[PDB]
Amino acid sequence: TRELQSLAAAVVPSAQTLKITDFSFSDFELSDLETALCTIRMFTDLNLVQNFQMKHEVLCRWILSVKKNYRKNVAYHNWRHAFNTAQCMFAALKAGKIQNKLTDLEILALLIAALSHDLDHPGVSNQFLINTNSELALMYNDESVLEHHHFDQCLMILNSPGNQILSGLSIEEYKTTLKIIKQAILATDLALYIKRRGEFFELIRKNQFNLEDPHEKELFLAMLMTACDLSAITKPWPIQQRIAELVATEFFDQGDRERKELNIEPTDLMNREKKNKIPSMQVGFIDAICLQLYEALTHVSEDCFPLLDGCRKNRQKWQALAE
Ligand SMILES: C=CCCOc1ncc(C(=C)O)cc1-c1nc2c(CC)[n+](C3CN(CC)C3)[nH]c2c(=O)[nH]1
Ligand SMILES: [Mg+2]
Ligand SMILES: [Zn+2]
Fold first, then answer.
1. Distance between CA atoms of residues 300 and 296, nearest Å
2. Which three-class secondary structure state does DSSP give residue 230?
3. Ligand 1 midpoint to CA 34 (Å)
4. For the chain, how many structural domains are there in total?
């Protein structure tokens, strides 16, 4: 406790004051308490609190439980990454004007999913867990191993006493919401993004994309989750540089684990000894994974252009270092 009393008693600053509507938002100068306040404001301004009768104390407790469940010493996949993913979701819904295209339940599910999508992340990839015979990999048949675990943790917190922010939903709304949350969290497995994005891009290319279609709406929500998950790649250069260092720290740590536990030379992405490959790998990552997604998102909502624009600027920055 303690931290809970401080959070629950604090006056929640406006979204304007907190700057959470800005796509260029930076969490670096914020304390943990400030990120928690930002999170309460996200729920509030997305019309989720009174809408679903959330008690202030319960929401505060839930937010703190989510924050605690991240491993602070994991370099990139920690609370700050989850918080930034949620902030990008808020900005996309607000400044990006996606909010009015979705239902209240979809919004509720997306914010919860964004905040919970990496819960208890071990700092190693699905491939690593599979190669080291993780019990997690066995239980989930090597499919989206981490993501199934993140969802498991998400449910655990949602059901923990004093943290039930969904206790006010009707039976049918609860059922609908949990299904969207699971799909949203699983969507953050880049393997599923690569597997399903082809369909999304094709629908748009052939002018067949229709949000009114249940299946396409679900496909869009998955893509939106990926767009928010990768959002650091759209941030102003100083921010992208700093976060890229965190990503490298985490990947190189896994590389160390691979040399010791698997007796193998890690791929460049996880090889500290070849860190000189970072600029070129970043450009390739932006081209193959990022640009098409932000281009597609902007097509759906022009107001999301800032994400694409920021991504393009970072490609230029990384390319200048690579050439
Ligand atoms: C060594 C690390 C260098 C820094 O790396 C980064 N820094 C920041 C971000 C971000 C979202 O801002 C992202 C990265 C970053 N992430 C990468 C990932 C995981 C999604 N992959 C795998 C391999 N590919 C197969 C298709 C998917 N390659 C990446 C890369 O080159 N860069
Ligand atoms: Mg993840
Ligand atoms: Zn993530």
1. 6
2. coil
3. 28
4. 1
